[PDB]
Design a protein around this ligand. Structure first.
Ligand SMILES: Nc1ncnc2c1ncn2[C@@H]1O[C@H](COP(=O)(O)OP(=O)(O)O)[C@@H](O)[C@H]1O
Ligand SMILES: Nc1ncnc2c1ncn2[C@@H]1O[C@H](COP(=O)(O)OP(=O)(O)O)[C@@H](O)[C@H]1O
Ligand SMILES: Nc1ncnc2c1ncn2[C@@H]1O[C@H](COP(=O)(O)OP(=O)(O)O)[C@@H](O)[C@H]1O
Lengths: 52, 77, 371, 371, 371
């Protein structure tokens, strides 16, 4: 095994990754959904500014 | 229909996303008389005709078993 | 044709034609959306969910709450809710009826202007009205004078109404409603330290608020009983999962109304606010109000409030004069019921807004035309 | 045209078109090579052998096993296997269908990237997808929510799935699969001390794992019966050669799942892992999962697992609430069956990878695009 | 005589007399026990092990972790730890000093009551106190007003303190501490798929958390650099064995604090929690806190947190007004240091609990007497 497994696994699993994760897209969407202070206070400032 | 244990309403909603905006000649049926619910409205060479849903999806479902005829093949008849 | 009323008093939302005894059905005004990657490809993705549908679906949904402090937070969400309610429950088209709107008093014009703007434009609806809670409360309770306390899901009220007129100076308006109390509850609950914070987890408390609460008769004496006894303590299940068993933590909660230290503010409380607001109002009327004292909705549901209230007034009143309070059974529905009555009388035909005005003048129309 | 799915869930390997009830045939993913000088000059020398061909040929061949711990060990060997499978069983050309790939969840990107890279380049194939086991398990079992346990040839799983979504934090993933258990078996077996170690000798055990195993109902009580009785003990032949007869050594084996001391690790076991992972997940959902509990594949084949599992949950659950588990007949096939369903729905036409993307962007595409 | 303070802020545990600059030594509060048959008969069997002794001995020991979520899990284990600490490091007898206890705020009474009960009974100790972290944090940082963030081994905090007073309603308390983050790390790490799960293996990560982490300045931009460069990637050894080399997997970790999706929860994060909790608190004070902003301990060690925090506040603040944060060097020690100061002032002689009260009334004494 020390030859057989390691020849592949040491060599290739060296370089594992690159992506702009779709899971991070999920995170971004969620944080947008759950920036309460952003949505609510923007909406309230926008409306409440107009007084007639 | 292989999505199980769920309701034609689900597809209703999938209609409403999928076609109801997109597909011009198909329509949400207007109100009309004679019927509790009608769900589809589309346009035909005969003119334009409108039709309705009971949950029946499974009726088209085809089960199979080898076994049934498999053994009947043994049988006397 | 026929006439239809929306209740948008917060909490579950109430809608029904004039002359039915009770609204057809009622919805929390929860709004909620997905939290996780959608991984059944078979599933249709719907990105927003509301009502008992959501109440079932909750767990991966997460909640937004479109009314803070009686102020409705995000309009388009409301529009979603509203559309759903009409079509799904009501099977109703905007043309079909005049529609009547239910408002916190003394709150920013914007809710008036956008609400009307949307509902005349987005919906197109024969006649519109927005009405202040207390008026309905009187009509249902049927005493032309009065003072009302109704602390719903949302901002909590004192209005004296005299027969046929408003005293808008008299009026007191408070953000003390049960939701914020409930969120204080958790800061209690960690004492026993079964502990969870998220929106749905917070609504789970609502059930306990139904079941487990009752009003302190006397605070000191209750503490003495708390030292003596466990009958004060009752055993309750998770909606699913564990049995949970709760001490003084039940009764301590309502006292916040009497003492909003526990989440800390100064306004000297329901009762002292009330007597204050009385002492603002003039001298002769007062006896009537001492007689006519009226309460409703979300907090009032608790057993016993009226009694300690009376104890408080007997503290503050000159004992010499009669005192009583009204505690009807139906208080939580009261508003929409009164709205039905309000809908009934032909005078609103004189009174409704019509599309024509909305054509010829803006949202500005309302603020003259309505209270 | 038509659409084709490979199962590379480890153990024998399963492949079949959408809509067939069961894959055409199935192969271990053994790989093996010669061990001795080739001394029939008449023989053609082939230097690598796979599949039932090898399963016959084994004795002078020696095995390599191209998937450890669900991680596929040596790519070019896989390519040999894969090529063979297409041409020899399937009589299929890479252009012919979209092809669907079956993955351990939560495991290193590399398997994704090279798998796709090879199969788009080395094979040239209209559309590609890689899918997580549990999704298929639900689709076949047809309950949109659930939790799955499937401990195959390879790394052993807990995933709760709620309807339409993933909880990737919730998930637990374990290298406890039956192969390593079997290799522990030998360290048992030397007690009776009929003893042999090599790969083929190890696979011989697999038959015994088919035939001779059954699940301990209660460990102490079983030991008491072990002292009492020999009905616990059964007599079995070498595949050729001797009769062999086996005591508690049969039932002791599965307990490792409950107690991975015997080859020693800490993760508190299948069931405690499951309840742990539950208690991670949120409060309200839980009842459904208490209802909907689902198991499949290699280990589950054993008679009785579900029962002691239920015993365990009745230990750990508050007894108050309903509990049951599902134990379908077909579990070992379940995955590929679900894959067939997965293949069926047109939405993957929206969803497949196409060659074009692989042209225009790398393997990186997958990790956004797929789960 | 002289006065002695235990820190039981979780992680390594800190203890020292009043007026020393830094505690004498410090211990993880790991607890661990044997895993294997003891097979050197020459060895003395000790069945439980703690502290750097265990940290050496670990491999056959297996860990228990006596504090979850800042809540101390198993009392008798604590008692073992505590006894050891006194006698082995401190060479101290319970009579010798008043002793001061260090508490997560807003957490279940039980920790108070048993802690005091044990330490007055099991140890017999002149004077006792339990104190809330933020108070010490101010005293050490020496600004009488403030807000503190300190996310230790254990549950993670927001408290505004104004000069001389508490705002217990204001306060936010979160289970987001670095341990759970670290356990998420593994679910990261399997991407590169060098993979190991057990307690000691988990603590090995702690070193990497020391060495390899740094704070994302901007997430998108960092991803762009991640596509560009490998300087983002650094090479690190096993504590023994291999060299390991780590990409974005380092910086991605702290973002969880800003986005607790990655192990998924809703509380909108450190910074949004903070500004929320501000907007709870009243209007005029706010500028001071905009000025006085203070952070400490386990997570804060990371380079750069304060900067992105300031970026976040500049997002959320009206830019018009001054903003800064404090990031002292010594934060991880800060608490015990402040405790030393707390010990110094004679007023606790007015303030300590004495044995006499514990005689004359129960643990109940504390909850009136202390915060
Ligand atoms: N069974 C119950 N017992 C006590 N309180 C309840 C019960 N059911 C609902 N509530 C509370 O009553 C309120 C319902 O909303 P509502 O009173 O209609 O508010 P609004 O006055 O804004 O319309 C909420 O605060 C809800 O938590
Ligand atoms: N008759 C049987 N009884 C019990 N276990 C079996 C039987 N046949 C195969 N197995 C085991 O089931 C597994 C077959 O592989 P599989 O379950 O498909 O793994 P994977 O989940 O990786 O696809 C192997 O562990 C094999 O030893
Ligand atoms: N060099 C370091 N770099 C970053 N974090 C560290 C370092 N050393 C320890 N930590 C973390 O700091 C915390 C130490 O415990 P502590 O901060 O005292 O928690 P508590 O606030 O409960 O006392 C743990 O989360 C530990 O992993």
């Amino acid at each position: 095994x020390x030859x057989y497994x390691x020849x592949x696994x040491x060599x290739x699993x060296x370089x594992x990754x690159x992506x702009x994760x779709x899971x991070x897209x999920x995170x971004x969407x969620x944080x947008x959904x759950x920036x309460x202070x952003x949505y609510x206070x923007x909406x309230x400032x926008x409306x409440x500014x107009x007084x007639x | 229909c292989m999505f199980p244990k769920a309701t034609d309403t689900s597809f209703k909603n999938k209609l409403y996303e999928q076609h109801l905006g997109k597909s011009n000649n198909f329509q949400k049926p207007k109100p009309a008389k004679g019927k509790a619910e009608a769900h589809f409205s589309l346009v035909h060479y005969a003119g334009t005709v409108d039709y309705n849903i009971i949950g029946w999806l499974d009726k088209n479902k085809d089960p199979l078993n080898e076994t049934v005829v498999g053994l009947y093949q043994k049988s006397g008849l | 044709t026929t006439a239809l009323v929306c209740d948008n008093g917060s909490g579950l939302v109430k809608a029904g034609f004039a002359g039915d005894d009770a609204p057809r059905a009622v919805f929390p005004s929860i709004v909620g959306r997905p939290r996780h990657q959608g991984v059944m490809v078979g599933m249709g993705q719907k990105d927003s969910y509301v009502g008992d549908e959501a109440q079932s679906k909750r767990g991966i949904l997460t909640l937004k709450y479109p009314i803070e402090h009686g102020i409705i937070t995000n309009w388009d969400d409301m529009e979603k809710i509203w559309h759903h309610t009409f079509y799904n429950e009501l099977r109703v088209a905007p043309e079909e009826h005049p529609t009547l709107l239910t408002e916190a008093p003394l709150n920013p014009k914007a809710n008036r202007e956008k609400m009307t703007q949307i509902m005349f434009e987005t919906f197109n609806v024969p006649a519109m009205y927005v009405a202040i809670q207390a008026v309905l409360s009187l009509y249902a309770s049927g005493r032309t004078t009065g003072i009302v306390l109704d602390s719903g899901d949302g901002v909590t009220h004192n209005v004296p109404i005299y027969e046929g007129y408003a005293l808008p100076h008299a009026i007191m308006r408070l953000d003390l409603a049960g939701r914020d109390l409930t969120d204080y509850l958790m800061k209690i609950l960690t004492e026993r330290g079964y502990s969870f914070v998220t929106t749905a987890e917070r609504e789970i408390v609502r059930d306990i608020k139904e079941k487990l609460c009752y009003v302190a008769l006397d605070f000191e004496n209750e503490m003495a009983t708390a030292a003596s006894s466990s009958s004060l303590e009752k055993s309750y299940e998770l909606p699913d999962g564990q049995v949970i068993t709760i001490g003084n933590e039940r009764f301590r909660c309502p006292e916040t109304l009497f003492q909003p230290s526990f989440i800390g503010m100064e306004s000297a409380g329901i009762h002292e606010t009330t007597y204050n607001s009385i002492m603002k109002c003039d001298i002769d009327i007062r006896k009537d109000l001492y007689a006519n004292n009226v309460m409703s909705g979300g907090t009032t549901m608790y057993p016993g409030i009226a009694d300690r209230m009376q104890k408080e007034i007997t503290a503050l009143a000159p004992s010499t004069m009669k005192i009583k309070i009204i505690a009807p059974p139906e208080r939580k529905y009261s508003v929409w019921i009164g709205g039905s009555i309000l809908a009934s009388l032909s005078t609103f035909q004189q009174m409704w807004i019509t599309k024509q005005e909305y054509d010829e003048a803006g949202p500005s129309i309302v603020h003259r035309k309505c209270f």
